[PDB]
């Protein structure tokens, strides 16, 4: 959940020379909070089978430039539900927002494998 | 792999017509390139559909499709290439290395997303 940089490389297992080039290119960055979540696990392992197959660090902020667009897009979306939430006696809930959130991401996920199906 | 009509893709989404025909009029879900659907457009669909039950139109999705395409070709100048580099040996085909390239760059865009997003709410 909250992960410091060296639990993040040594859960990801790659070298610190591939995180370093990662953050120097803005493709994985730190939450608000300032720490790693497991989703950053999950890019560095990516990226490092990725690197693998020719594709450099540098390569990969379009992946990063473009999820930051849809992730816009999703705020629009969703943060007018944070506030529909079913909160209960708690003051807020954000459970709502996360559902549709998590709706417009399969969705545009299921786009990208159909279009990469075709083109290939 | 699996080539619907337009109505098998109906019954296996159970979702109505209306709406297929606002996602196809705006854009977010085509026919392949024979005029089938595949598995993917199930699956759109019925997210579009949920979707649409929290006030989020088919047109308003449209920007979903048009991202997807760019991505889809950024993985394309990744992947094409390695179409080619597939063992095909007698236990092979050689579609899977291009295959693997393109599911590992569709994960990390996929984590890159919900990285992005649990920030932008957090
Ligand atoms: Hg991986
Ligand atoms: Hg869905």
Redesign the interface.
Known sequence: MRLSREDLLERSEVADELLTALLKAG?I?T???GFF?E??V??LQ??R??AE???EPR??R???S??????????Q???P??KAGKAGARDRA?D??????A??????????????????
Do not use: N
């Open positions: 493709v960055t939450g608000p909070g979540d989703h950053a999950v890019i990516c990226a089978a990725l197959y020719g594709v390569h990969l379009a992946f990063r473009a999820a930051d667009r849809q992730s816009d897009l999703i705020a979306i969703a943060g539900l944070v954000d709502l927002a996360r559902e549709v959130a709706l417009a991401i399969t969705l545009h996920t299921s786009l990208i494998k159909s279009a990469v199906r075709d083109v290939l």
